[PDB]
């Protein structure tokens, strides 16, 4: 309930967790969903070293600016993305919450900057801008204007004017082992039948059975003298199974 004003967009770091994206693209509440070089269902399939999440408030017409190869007041002055941005964008409408009867001036957005932001560059400076011949140098007056602008989120406007909430996420390169992944399947076990199995990564075919072998707490699967898999530990109930090749 504390969404960031776009001029000072906040950033969230997510790592070492199960990233369940199934609800996100299944939920219809998100008016807009976009992935650049990525697919929604594939996100659960994929794993990343580390991922970030940015959030800011903008009205409907400004939501169109959040994308690679796009420009505008928001895109250039407040929050800029690169053209090779390998991430996704999620936005939804927040008119009732964000809009105030006299306009929601609690939220601010940048109107002026001496140069456009570089990708992911952040700036909250408030120096009075020189809008004319006068070297204002931080003094208000004629042609000396406050660089930030307060949001006029009045309820009595159309969809284009009404505020929106935006979330932008991206993932890092594979410089190290991944730490965030989609949820994995956990199917029911079978015994005394020939089945295909994939326990963690161990993949094989054979008939299964619980046996008397006593694994140590840390050991996951057994091995034979000839280096063929000979037993497995069930990762749900941690019971020790035994594997025999299909006849």
């Amino acid at each position, epitope marked *: 309930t504390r969404f960031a004003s776009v001029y000072a967009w906040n950033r969230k770091r997510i790592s070492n967790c199960v990233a369940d994206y199934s609800v996100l693209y299944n939920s219809a509440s998100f008016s807009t969903f976009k992935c650049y070089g990525v697919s929604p269902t594939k996100l659960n399939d994929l794993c990343f070293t580390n991922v970030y999440a940015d959030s800011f408030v903008i009205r409907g017409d400004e939501v169109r600016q959040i994308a690679p190869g796009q420009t505008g007041k928001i895109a250039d002055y407040n929050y800029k993305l690169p053209d090779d941005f390998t991430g996704c964008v999620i936005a939804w409408n927040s008119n009732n919450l964000d809009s105030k*009867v006299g306009g929601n001036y609690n939220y601010l957005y940048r109107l002026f900057r001496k140069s456009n932001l570089k990708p992911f560059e952040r700036d909250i400076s408030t120096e009075i801008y020189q809008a004319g011949s006068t070297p204002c140098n931080g003094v208000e007056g004629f042609n000396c204007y406050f660089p930030l602008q307060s949001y006029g989120f009045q309820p009595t406007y159309g969809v284009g004017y009404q505020p929106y909430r935006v979330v932008v996420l991206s993932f890092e390169l594979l410089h190290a082992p991944a730490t965030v992944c989609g949820p994995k399947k956990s199917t029911n076990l079978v015994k005394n039948k020939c089945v295909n199995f994939n326990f963690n990564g161990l993949t094989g075919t054979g008939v299964l059975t619980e046996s008397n072998k006593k694994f140590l707490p840390f050991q996951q699967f057994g091995r034979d003298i000839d280096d063929t898999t000979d037993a497995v530990r069930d990762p749900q109930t941690l019971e020790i199974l035994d594997i025999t090749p299909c006849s």
Partner: antibody
Framework: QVQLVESGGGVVQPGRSLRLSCAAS????????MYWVRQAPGKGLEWVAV????????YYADSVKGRFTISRDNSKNTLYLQMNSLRTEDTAVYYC?????????????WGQGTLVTVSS | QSALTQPASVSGSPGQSITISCTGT?????????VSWYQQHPGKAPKLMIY???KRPSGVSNRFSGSKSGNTASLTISGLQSEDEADYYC??????????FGGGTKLTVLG
């Protein structure tokens, strides 16, 4: 639950000044706009002017415009209504309401109200 | 006040479904989808259980539904019960940035 209590109902001659107030509790009063509503016996609901979350802007209906003024205190979580040019018809029960997470333009929470009496 | 127009009265047996309409000028109703509805009970202040024409706040029955059409918006009360017997009012926001209440509508559930 969010609660609103109206106070300041009084007996006054017509035209003479009068004050209505109501205090809020249980939520961020400063975050949301505030409203006033008045009802006559055996009749419907009538709307009264509005004040913004920070009090910087106001909007009035002609029946109360000029006659009544609305102000707020965000530290005491309280609302005020300053009244003048009253009439006998102005005798009614007044409620105040506020917006919430549902919407700043909603009259979500209501108090029990208070009574105003005007006669010569 | 310049109240919105509503039908005078309606009646139905328990378990039936009835709808109440709320109408006004284009600026009052048609301009935006912020219509809301209120319910009052004897010796109590009014209560609001509608927003954005159709949405249901918390602490509200599942029997309330609403829709908008042209310069008119309507509230439908399914599963009529004795508790529903009351006078109902609608509110909408005008382009003047002022809120307007309806004239009222009285519903009877034949318990």
């Amino acid at each position: 639950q969010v609660q609103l209590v109206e106070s300041g109902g009084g007996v006054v001659q017509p035209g003479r000044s009068l004050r209505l107030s109501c205090a809020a509790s249980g939520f961020t009063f400063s975050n949301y706009a505030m409203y006033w509503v008045r009802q006559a016996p055996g009749k419907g609901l009538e709307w009264v002017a509005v004040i913004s979350y920070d009090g910087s802007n106001k909007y009035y209906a002609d029946s109360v415009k000029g006659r009544f003024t609305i102000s707020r205190d965000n530290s005491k979580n309280t609302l005020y209504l300053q009244m003048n040019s009253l009439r006998t018809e102005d005798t009614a029960v007044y409620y105040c309401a506020s917006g919430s997470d549902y919407g700043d333009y909603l009259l979500v929470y209501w108090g029990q109200g208070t009574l105003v009496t005007v006669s010569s | 006040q310049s109240a919105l127009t509503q039908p005078a009265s309606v009646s139905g047996s328990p378990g039936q479904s009835i709808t109440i309409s709320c109408t006004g000028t284009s600026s009052d109703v048609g301009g935006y989808n912020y219509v809301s509805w209120y319910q009052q009970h004897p010796g109590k202040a009014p209560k609001l259980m509608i927003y954005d024409v159709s949405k249901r706040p918390s602490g509200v029955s599942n029997r309330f539904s609403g829709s908008k059409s042209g310069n008119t918006a309507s509230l439908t009360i399914s599963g009529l019960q004795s508790e529903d017997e009351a006078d109902y009012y609608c509110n909408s926001l005008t382009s003047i940035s002022t809120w307007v209440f309806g004239g009222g509508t009285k519903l009877t559930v034949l318990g």
